[PDB]
Amino acid sequence: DLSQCDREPIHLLGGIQSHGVLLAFRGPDRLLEVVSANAQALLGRPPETLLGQPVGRVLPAEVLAQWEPLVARGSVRVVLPAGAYRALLHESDGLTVLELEPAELQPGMEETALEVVRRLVSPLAGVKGTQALLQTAADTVRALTGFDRVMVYRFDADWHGEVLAESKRGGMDGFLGMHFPATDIPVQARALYTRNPLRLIADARARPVPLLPPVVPALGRPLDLSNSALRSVSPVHLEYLRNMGVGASFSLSLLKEGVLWGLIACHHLEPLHISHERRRACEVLTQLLALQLSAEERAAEASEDAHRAALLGQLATAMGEGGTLEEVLEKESERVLALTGAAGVALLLGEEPLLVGCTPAQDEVEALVAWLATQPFQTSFHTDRLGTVYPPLAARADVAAGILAVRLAPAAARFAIWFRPEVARTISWAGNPRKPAEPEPGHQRLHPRGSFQAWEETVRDTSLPWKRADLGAAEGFRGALV
Amino acid sequence: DLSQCDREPIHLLGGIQSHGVLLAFRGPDRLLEVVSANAQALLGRPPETLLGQPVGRVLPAEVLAQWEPLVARGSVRVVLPAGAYRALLHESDGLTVLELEPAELQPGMEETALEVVRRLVSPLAGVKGTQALLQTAADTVRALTGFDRVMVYRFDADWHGEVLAESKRGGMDGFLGMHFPATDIPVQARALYTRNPLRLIADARARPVPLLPPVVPALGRPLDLSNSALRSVSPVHLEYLRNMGVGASFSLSLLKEGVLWGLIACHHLEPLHISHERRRACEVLTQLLALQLSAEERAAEASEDAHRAALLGQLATAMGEGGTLEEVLEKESERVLALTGAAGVALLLGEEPLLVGCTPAQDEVEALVAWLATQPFQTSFHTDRLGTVYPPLAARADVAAGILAVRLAPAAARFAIWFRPEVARTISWAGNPRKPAEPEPGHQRLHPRGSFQAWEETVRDTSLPWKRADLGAAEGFRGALV
Numbered sequence A, B: 001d002l003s004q005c006d007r008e009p010i011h012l013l014g015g016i017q018s019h020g021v022l023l024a025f026r027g028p029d030r031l032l033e034v035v036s037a038n039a040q041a042l043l044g045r046p047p048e049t050l051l052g053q054p055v056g057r058v059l060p061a062e063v064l065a066q067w068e069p070l071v072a073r074g075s076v077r078v079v080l081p082a083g084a085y086r087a088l089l090h091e092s093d094g095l096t097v098l099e100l101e102p103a104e105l106q107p108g109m110e111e112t113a114l115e116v117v118r119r120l121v122s123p124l125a126g127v128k129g130t131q132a133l134l135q136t137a138a139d140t141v142r143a144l145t146g147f148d149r150v151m152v153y154r155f156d157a158d159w160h161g162e163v164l165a166e167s168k169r170g171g172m173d174g175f176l177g178m179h180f181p182a183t184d185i186p187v188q189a190r191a192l193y194t195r196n197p198l199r200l201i202a203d204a205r206a207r208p209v210p211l212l213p214p215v216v217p218a219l220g221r222p223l224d225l226s227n228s229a230l231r232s233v234s235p236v237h238l239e240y241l242r243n244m245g246v247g248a249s250f251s252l253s254l255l256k257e258g259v260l261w262g263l264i265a266c267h268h269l270e271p272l273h274i275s276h277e278r279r280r281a282c283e284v285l286t287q288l289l290a291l292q293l294s295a296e297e298r299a300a301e302a303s304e305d306a307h308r309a310a311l312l313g314q315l316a317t318a319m320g321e322g323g324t325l326e327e328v329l330e331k332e333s334e335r336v337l338a339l340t341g342a343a344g345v346a347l348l349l350g351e352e353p354l355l356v357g358c359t360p361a362q363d364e365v366e367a368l369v370a371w372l373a374t375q376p377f378q379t380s381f382h383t384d385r386l387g388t389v390y391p392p393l394a395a396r397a398d399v400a401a402g403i404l405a406v407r408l409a410p411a412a413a414r415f416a417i418w419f420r421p422e423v424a425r426t427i428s429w430a431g432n433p434r435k436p437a438e439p440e441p442g443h444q445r446l447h448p449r450g451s452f453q454a455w456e457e458t459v460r461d462t463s464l465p466w467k468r469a470d471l472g473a474a475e476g477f478r479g480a481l482v
Ligand SMILES: C/C=C1/C(Cc2[nH]c(Cc3[nH]c(CC4=NC(=O)C(CC)=C4C)c(C)c3CCC(=O)O)c(CCC(=O)O)c2C)=NC(=O)[C@H]1C
Pocket: A004, A005, A006, A008, A010, A151, A153, A161, A163, A175, A180, A183, A184, A185, A186, A189, A199, A201, A232, A233, A234, A236, A237, A240, A249, A250, A251, A263, A265, A266, A436, A437, A446, A447, A448, A449
């Protein structure tokens, strides 16, 4: 449901954060076309007096002197009388956009950032699970930014999320283990954060600084700030932060193999500015974690296939040793079950269903057998909640919350079906997920929820999900039965 | 081992390079027990007069001021009248070993290294090959060090190596594409390079600085310099370098999943010193490259499996279709051959052999079968030079240089044998591989070979090697079974 939440154009809000200045120029003269309203504190003259002026008569010599590596490199450090600033350049709406924000002051920041990069490559990290890998990545981002709380947030397939790992101060609330509704990060935010993988909110309490004029005159809408480092965020998100009692927020996108896997979210209790250069140090760490995860996930998957493949191998040996099919599938039953991590399996070699291990009754299997043949899968069907899709067995969550069926034949209904029971899980939501926002009367003004306290839910009638190795092994068991 | 090359104890040569100073202290009084003979170059006083003195009365006050940071984190920067020095600390033979070496002088070194870490950790690292990945790794190690020539050197299974990639300055002799004898890096050097992954030879023409006394008086042999950053290398190697025309050399071990995969080898035409901290920066790059290679390689492997599994899946559908075995094997010829990347296949199903694709003659298959029937393999057998193990077919490298046989049976002779033709290869060696060293008469004193000029050989009678995916596909084709 395209929520109110999803429709907010958060790149077109017309404001920037007060700790920096934004300037936009167009054309060969580089005429000032847009400028933030706080520009006087760095430019000297009041902003309105500088609209339409050539860049050489609006910027101080220190900035103009760096224009070429600014254009080439996209960012440079400059010393203004007001202090050290980072200048960032990008293009947007056919304007040249220049942002200035206080520069990194710690001389050894990069030296410290190289140390934490070493912790995250190491010999082999993640030796005691991917859980150790996430925790280490949380600890390093926290050690490098100084934030009170750093959390590793993973998106589930429904785009709801859970905090898998956490690194925070002593005497500090936490959210380790909790789940958050998908609307906490609406769809347009996720699309932006897929392209722009960093965002700092340096002071959740502060008021945004408007742009001058409020629309780009050629366009009739505000300047697109998709790529702006100073962009002020959705006001409903600030209210969300304030409802958490956090004063500053900084999060980096975790793109793994091109997809938005999750976020590293940082919270501070007080306002706090992280330099551009320090933000990029952290961006190196998150691309490093993403690499380590792909490398360990692909090894976990290879090891898993190796286990299943050896099961098929022992089955093959067992077949060619005594023309006793129903007999070997009886003596070798737990290998047949282990193939897909299952607890029962019906075999439709034709006559009567051969029922091995823990299964539903002969009547009930022949009843979903007949139902299965008339479905739009070609070789294999699988679900982890049979009952929501075939209610004749909704009451049998104890043996068939999940099934995995391969078709052993072109036409005709020759099947091998693996069964799984339900596995109850208690997920703990940060706030009541039935009430993920508070609309005003009239439903034109949304507010974040006011509470984040643990609200517990138990999931029934769904099995362990069928993993890729399971499917692979089933496909190969199908190859072994003509 | 075999060579006199393997005998040389390169950790007990008792010399350091002239650009640093080594001190070793024993016991609670930190008494000076070993010292390099150049020690006066930084210590003011003759070394011999300092043996047996407490650390408090031998080290300059600048160093002593940093004793506790040094002892704590094991590495520190100290400013001496001679200039800025990195102090490094380790333990060996129950001594505390203190090494001094010129410190890094570029203040933005770490910032510079974080930029090249970005280049190498970027997602989109692979998107023109694992080849493009090595090239980038050479280019960035070269950017960060300044060496004339950087090469990526991979060890083959017999521990000879070849240069896979190369970043060099304009107008430099290359080595890209050449092969080097295994004895070029003998057995005990590979061992030491597996636990000590960095080494710098700052001036190939310099004489080493001896240690005083020439033995550790407790042990009766020289101090162990395994972990010494200043260790002077084997004289046979310094000679190898000079014959190669190089004045400085620096190499890093490429350790992949525990094993010594290869080296990044750097050559400089002049003498040149890299600071310790800049050496540790490059080490971050090599561990990064190792990470990227494991992930890409494991991706390639998974993709191969998937293609193979699709072939098995398409085969199984052709079964349980119409006809008999040999019927569907007739249509599915190309699939059965592609399962293992093969040019022919023989099927011993009990009758006469069934010969598909490009096979040797029937009588020859039956000879090969009767011989395979005795061999000591469990389910699978493979080789890539059949003729060396079975000379009846040694003439037939046009259809049968490589074979992969699986046993479709137990104590029976039922096989599927896949055949591969030879693939001729032109190895280019750096110098004549038949004379990889020039010994003096009597064979006491050895010397590197004199020339590294390209020297070609062509490898006949060897098929392309059998990969894991071929093996897996064969095991799974054996899934069939009468
Ligand atoms: C109706 C819309 C809603 C929104 C909307 C929302 N929520 C967000 C952003 C958001 N929401 C969240 C959610 C979030 N922060 C956390 O720490 C956790 C768990 C621990 C979560 C789920 C994050 C991390 C962000 C990125 C900004 C940041 O790092 O602080 C946006 C885009 C902000 C912008 O870029 O302008 C928008 C439009 N949140 C709600 O709870 C509801 C009421």
